Write a protein that binds this ligand. Structure first.
Ligand SMILES: *[C@@H]1O[C@H](CO[C@H]2O[C@@H](C)[C@@H](O)[C@@H](O)[C@@H]2O)[C@@H](O[C@@H]2O[C@H](CO)[C@@H](O)[C@H](O)[C@H]2NC(C)=O)[C@H](O)[C@H]1NC(C)=O
Ligand SMILES: *[C@@H]1O[C@H](CO[C@H]2O[C@@H](C)[C@@H](O)[C@@H](O)[C@@H]2O)[C@@H](O[C@@H]2O[C@H](CO)[C@@H](O)[C@H](O)[C@H]2NC(C)=O)[C@H](O)[C@H]1NC(C)=O
Ligand SMILES: *[C@@H]1O[C@H](CO)[C@@H](O[C@@H]2O[C@H](CO)[C@@H](O)[C@H](O)[C@H]2NC(C)=O)[C@H](O)[C@H]1NC(C)=O
Ligand SMILES: *[C@@H]1O[C@H](CO)[C@@H](O[C@@H]2O[C@H](CO)[C@@H](O)[C@H](O)[C@H]2NC(C)=O)[C@H](O)[C@H]1NC(C)=O
Ligand SMILES: *[C@@H]1O[C@H](CO)[C@@H](O)[C@H](O)[C@H]1NC(C)=O
Ligand SMILES: *[C@@H]1O[C@H](CO)[C@@H](O)[C@H](O)[C@H]1NC(C)=O
Ligand SMILES: *[C@@H]1O[C@H](CO)[C@@H](O)[C@H](O)[C@H]1NC(C)=O
Ligand SMILES: *[C@@H]1O[C@H](CO)[C@@H](O)[C@H](O)[C@H]1NC(C)=O
Ligand SMILES: *[C@@H]1O[C@H](CO)[C@@H](O)[C@H](O)[C@H]1NC(C)=O
Ligand SMILES: *[C@@H]1O[C@H](CO)[C@@H](O)[C@H](O)[C@H]1NC(C)=O
Ligand SMILES: CC(C)OP(=O)(O)O
Ligand SMILES: CC(C)OP(=O)(O)O
Ligand SMILES: [Cl-]
Ligand SMILES: [Cl-]
Ligand SMILES: [Cl-]
Ligand SMILES: [Cl-]
Lengths: 524, 524
């Protein structure tokens, strides 16, 4: 099966899925390889080829450091790249239903990884189930991460910042230009992403250059107002300068720093990324989105507050235990291989790990809010995970949702509270960050895969809600006497819970905690 | 001029005021002298006399410690008793217009003094101007203060607690029974009081036994939810026991403690009051109102929250610099005789003076809220006064007013921001606690008295607003193109400013500060 695109012909492959067929185009190029003089620059448009480009396997993932904390452990290693790393990584994937759809709604996935890691080729991002079951087209792209994606010297087109966000945007344009040839509708495009991919989705809502490149947006565990999501101009300069220093690239002409940096081996850039900050945390985002005056015209908090964003429906959600994953990457007394009962003093040390440049009064105030017990051995263990999850993910998603909904548009908020029966991490970690993704992509619809029946049904329903959101702007499941998902409004603040037992309409998720993070904490 | 009362005849005296005449009955007894076996007991009803009781001078003030901090200084000494002290102090005063009114509205004054001091005979509480100018009747009473008024052993009728509040109540009853004989209307009775007298007024709103004894209420700089106004059952026991210890009255039968205490000289009781707490502040209320199960049936915060109070109009207000008066009674670096520029470290020490049993985190949180400057030498001096005024007076009055108004009734809130031209305290102390009182009582209407013309006019208007509140439930001045005083509602929270220049309608007095005291601080 060959499809003609604006730039040339591409050949896909056929896949058998659930007694049916999906056509996959894995590894289509969508920009000039950002090599040599192009390193650190905005992606450049691709020139046409003749002959048939073979899109029959996943392409290279972008250069990135890897999680080596737990070698041989599936819980961590499932997130590591499963394709060669290369600066030559600007590729995308298309999954289309078979037979070819006529005008299918398009779902475009943006992976997370803290803007430092990730790739579109992970097993948990495999778009074939969605294409099979919902007759949507799924698109996913690789975008540059780390310094190669986000090194910033404000205004300097040699290293303008946000390059990885421009990679995402050029791929959204590729879909606008090319997806009708695959039977897709460019006027019915939903972005969806998780963590940094969700924060990325939220920034496309703010970027004028992305306005016309999509219809609706889904934000899983992330948004651009999360404390890790946007690098200040101040931090970004300092970090670019530290990178320069660490690589023998300290200069006077700023364009001489970049020219020098362009001569370094990709691997020398990667090795030095960790150290550009004096004290990092497990949630460090050394190189991330900045206000560059191009993709992002002003501090995004100001844009959100004042209603300067694309007016459309949003679907937003978080997981019950967002913060737990992070505790075993540096918090004292924690371990994936025991129940991690910590003491008051370990808790206090843990705050120091997660809030390194925060005043002592700042830290005691967290302690004060989070240690008024209602004792129980796991009090402290549980509080630290909640601290981390509320501050970094839940309260920001909830605030993003209130502020966005205040300008008129329908918003839907979910609280995912199901722990995978296959989860390789311990029980105390609960409903972890990243672990709704496999339900969204329909992995439990595969009966061979060892999930329970209740999980198949949960996945089926979520897949239907996401597809209905995408096609119709309303994440209902209308056929099986399902709980109706109410609009989230800043007054009532209704949200839907997602779980195998009984799905509920509830109100004001984390009301007390978020008042602390959102109103008070930003003052310290 | 002789008037027959239920208990006997009383003779008054005539007074010349503003080219007219007022009749004064100064020193009418309203209960059995609470002496001997009656010490610490609820006031007992007075038995009739024959012959004419001479009410021609102020009676004894109740026993109390005196402010000796500034001998010969008018600023402090104007508040000290100006009549002999005696346990034989249960007397009241009546000022009536001449000629005798037909059915005049009645204004009943309850003095403050932290429930430890005060008397109805102060020059600033002289009811003759009000009687002359507004043709109201003014009543005022002495009530027991300190341990003699408020010593509590819950449930024990030898020392039940709240005796001074029962003194106030028996005097309200005396007015119900006797004021028609003076030309007054028992159905048109407004209580007004300042500081502890205002807190007392607010408790009469909660006490079922006071329900039928008045119509409306005015609260100047105080309410029962202020942090100093109600003694916990816990503190009260401890304090009664410490008093016992200090006087050689420690016993086993609790009624043996009281019997012993009844043998002590009044002066030995007074001397020991200060020490019943390990650490007091300048705002200490050693012996005050308790939940006694009689005057007060439950924790007053619960009563207010749940709407269990007399449904009527209230007029509530505070002064611009409530907290300053207190700083020269123990805060380091402060003095009435210099400009009291303190440093950060003095500020911190001052918090320790005012918040002695408060966690170190509690104190830094005050510091954090109050030291974000917009530097200026008087930053710290000003912040400490604001801390003290907001916490102790302004935020509680504002909260009382919101909560009361939420049950349907009209409430009016004022912010008194005029500094007396005659104020003997320094300028840095500004618009002090206690210094609206002389405007309310019309002292500036006396032209001989050295006040400015703008002050005469301000006093005239306030007197008219208070009298209109009392007579008609609406503190308007309707004749002189005055700013209309809007109802205070918990949404808009409109208040009127009182000053010589221009009177304003403003909103949400101390919004940021009170969120701190009212929502957050009670948690520490
Ligand atoms: C801006 O960067 C400086 C640079 O210091 C860094 O040098 C880099 C090459 C890298 O190795 C990095 O780890 C190292 O810290 C930071 O200055 C440092 O600040 C800390 C304060 O805790 C000191 O302990 C370091 O000694 C100090 N180094 C120097 C040379 O001054 C600085 O903290 C940073 N500022 C910002 C914006 O956070
Ligand atoms: C309840 O009262 C006790 C009694 O202690 C007091 O004895 C009184 C007669 C009087 O002189 C008073 O000043 C004295 O403090 C309090 O116990 C005291 O607590 C403080 C703690 O700061 C200690 O430093 C004292 O040594 C200690 N004394 C004794 C004998 O224990 C106690 O604080 C108080 N509790 C409450 C309810 O606040
Ligand atoms: C869980 O495992 C961790 C790591 O193995 C344990 O934390 C260690 O405990 C002891 C003393 O507290 C020390 O030898 C190490 O320094 C600790 N490591 C870290 C990173 O804190 C922890 O004790 C275990 N807890 C259990 C079994 O509850
Ligand atoms: C205002 O007066 C007070 C009291 O007289 C001064 O505070 C004193 O200052 C010195 C040193 O700071 C000490 O000798 C005393 O211990 C202080 N007394 C108290 C109670 O703090 C203060 O210095 C004066 N401040 C001025 C002129 O600004
Ligand atoms: C692409 O795939 C086709 C079909 O098998 C093959 O014949 C062709 O040679 C391929 N082109 C390459 C390897 O570049
Ligand atoms: C796809 O649907 C859109 C409306 O969203 C319509 O305007 C467009 O022409 C359609 N394209 C097809 C069926 O080719
Ligand atoms: C509706 O329920 C049926 C079973 O009665 C199931 O086969 C189907 O997958 C469900 N549809 C959705 C979208 O959940
Ligand atoms: C009360 O005053 C009257 C009038 O002057 C006087 O004649 C009478 O004796 C007085 N009674 C006393 C002093 O008890
Ligand atoms: C006083 O006015 C009241 C109404 O508040 C009325 O009921 C009462 O009879 C009046 N008493 C007089 C004029 O004696
Ligand atoms: C109204 O103003 C006049 C002067 O025109 C003044 O004499 C009078 O006291 C004022 N009345 C009140 C109640 O303020
Ligand atoms: C790592 C965290 C900051 O973000 P998401 O997991 O991309
Ligand atoms: C002294 C303060 C606590 O109260 P008022 O001055 O009565
Ligand atoms: Cl929960
Ligand atoms: Cl359901
Ligand atoms: Cl002010
Ligand atoms: Cl006016």
């Amino acid at each position: 099966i060959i499809i003609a695109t604006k730039n040339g012909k591409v050949r896909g492959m056929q896949l058998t899925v659930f007694g049916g067929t999906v056509t996959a185009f894995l590894g289509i190029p969508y920009a000039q390889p950002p090599l040599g003089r192009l390193r650190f620059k905005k992606p450049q448009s691709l020139t046409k080829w003749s002959d048939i480009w073979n899109a029959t396997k996943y392409a290279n993932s972008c250069c990135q450091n890897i999680d080596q904390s737990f070698p041989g452990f599936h819980g961590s290693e499932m997130w590591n790249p499963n394709t060669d790393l290369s600066e030559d990584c600007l590729y995308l994937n298309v999954w289309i239903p078979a037979p070819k759809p006529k005008n299918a709604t398009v779902l475009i996935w943006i992976y997370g990884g803290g803007f430092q890691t990730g790739t579109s080729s992970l097993h948990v991002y495999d778009g074939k189930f969605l294409a099979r079951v919902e007759r949507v087209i799924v698109v996913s792209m690789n975008y540059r991460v780390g310094a190669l994606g986000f090194l910033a010297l404000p205004g300097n087109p040699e290293a303008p910042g946000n390059m990885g966000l421009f990679d995402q945007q050029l791929a959204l344009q590729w879909v606008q230009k090319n997806i009708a040839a695959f039977g897709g509708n460019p006027k019915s495009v939903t972005l969806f992403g998780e963590s940094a991919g969700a924060a990325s989705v939220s920034l496309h809502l703010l970027s004028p250059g992305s306005h016309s490149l999509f219809t609706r947006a889904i934000l899983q565990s992330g948004s651009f107002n999360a404390p890790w999501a946007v690098t200040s101009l101040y931090e970004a300069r300092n970090r670019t300068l530290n990178l320069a220093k660490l690589t023998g690239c300290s200069r006077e002409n700023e364009t001489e720093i970049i020219k020098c940096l362009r001569n370094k081996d990709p691997q020398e850039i990667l090795l030095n990324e960790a150290f550009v900050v004096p004290y990092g945390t497990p949630l460090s985002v050394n190189f991330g989105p900045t206000v560059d005056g191009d993709f992002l015209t002003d501090m995004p908090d100001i844009l959100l507050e004042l209603g300067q964003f694309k007016k459309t429906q949003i679907l937003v959600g978080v997981n019950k235990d967002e913060g737990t994953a992070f505790l075993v990457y540096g918090a004292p007394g924690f371990s994936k291989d025991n129940n991690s009962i910590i003491t008051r003093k370990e808790f206090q040390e843990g705050l120091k790990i997660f809030f390194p440049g925060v005043s002592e009064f700042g830290k005691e105030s967290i302690l004060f809010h989070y240690t008024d017990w209602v004792q129980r051995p796991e009090n402290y263990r549980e509080a630290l995970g909640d601290v981390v999850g509320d501050y970094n993910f839940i309260c920001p998603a909830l605030e993003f949702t209130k502020k966005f909904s205040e300008w008129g548009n329908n918003a839907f908020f979910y609280y995912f509270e199901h722990r995978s029966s296959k989860l390789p991490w311990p029980e105390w970690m609960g409903v972890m960050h990243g672990y709704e993704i496999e339900f969204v992509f329909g992995l439990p619809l595969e009966r061979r895969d060892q999930y329970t029946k209740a999980e198949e049904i949960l996945s089926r329903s979520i897949v239907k809600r996401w597809a209905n959101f995408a096609k119709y702007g309303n994440p209902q499941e209308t056929q099986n006497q399902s709980t109706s998902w109410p609009v989230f409004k800043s007054t009532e603040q209704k949200y839907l819970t997602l779980n195998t037992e009984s799905t509920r309409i509830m109100t004001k998720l984390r009301a007390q905690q978020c008042r602390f993070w959102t109103s008070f904490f930003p003052k310290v």
